[PDB]
Amino acid sequence: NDCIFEVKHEGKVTGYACLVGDKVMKPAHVKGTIDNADLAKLAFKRSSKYDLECAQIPVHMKSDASKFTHEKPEGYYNWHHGAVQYSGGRFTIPTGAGKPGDSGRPIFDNKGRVVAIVLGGANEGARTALSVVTWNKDIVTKITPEGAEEW
Amino acid sequence: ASHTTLGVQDISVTAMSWVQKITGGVGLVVAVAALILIVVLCVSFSRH
Amino acid sequence: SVASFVLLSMVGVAVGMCMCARRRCITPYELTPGATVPFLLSLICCIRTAKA
Fold first, then answer.
1. 8 A C-beta contact, residue A128 and residue A82
2. Where in the cell is it found (chain C) (predicted)?
């Protein structure tokens, strides 16, 4: 279901604007600045050791937001190239489902409130496992397996 | 003068201990700031 | 003059390490959506008033 809050930067999506409650989280690991100038006046904050950048909604676009989110039980979730099976605390995909140019994409959840962003992955030999940032109820952290590429 | 010239910057008064008060005081403020950084350096490099 | 240059530079570097410690602590509590820095740590890193 792609019926969510939306953004783009220098034509690339460049990580989705996670209007998760009162926020404008913008996962731009790579080049881009605001094409979707409907809220251009961002008070940008960043910390590159968790790759992400962020700001706050004033009121103008608050009707575009989702409610808050952090839960991650075992099972499977959904992303822009199909299903993503999640077990042993990590997301996994069909080998080759992701590629360069998949530069920041959500895992949009099964019940209508976002979790995580994908940034890359490793080939296991026949499985593929993702490199990801995730919300831990408090803090934010990175998951990354042995030998992983980034996109 | 029937005596050796002073060390001019070496031999201050016994009551110069103001220099140990300020250098100890600022040295401890630096050590506390260094500890406060070493603590959150160690948490932000143990949260991956 | 050289002693007051080093001693004024030391309260500079001490506030500099306190600033680095504020930023490298608070950023992973400030980025996360729908989240807050916990009450005690909000006081220790000098934001707002009381338990607000």
1. no
2. Host Golgi apparatus, Host trans-Golgi network; Host cell membrane; Host cytoplasm; Host endoplasmic reticulum
A9 is a catalytic site residue: no
The alpha carbon dihedral of A90, A96, A97, A101 has a sign of positive
Active-site hit among A9, A102, A103, A131: A103
Q: How far apart are CA A151 and CA B6, in angstroms?
A: 70
Resolution in A: 3.3
Q: Which of A20, A142, A27, A26 is nearest to A90 (CA)?
A: A142
Q: Is A109 a catalytic residue?
A: no
Q: Which of C7, C11, C17 sits opposite B36 (nearest CB)?
A: C17
Contact of A141 with A70, CB cutoff 8 Å: no
Residues in C touching B33 (Cβ below 8 Å): 13-18, 21
In contact, A77 and A91? CB cutoff 8 Å: yes
d(CA A131, CA A120): 5
Resolved by: cryo-EM
Nearest-angstrom CA–CA distance, C9 and A110: 56
Catalytic residue flag (residue A51)? yes
Catalytic residue among A2, A38, A47, A51: A51
Cα–Cα dist A101/A80, whole Å: 12
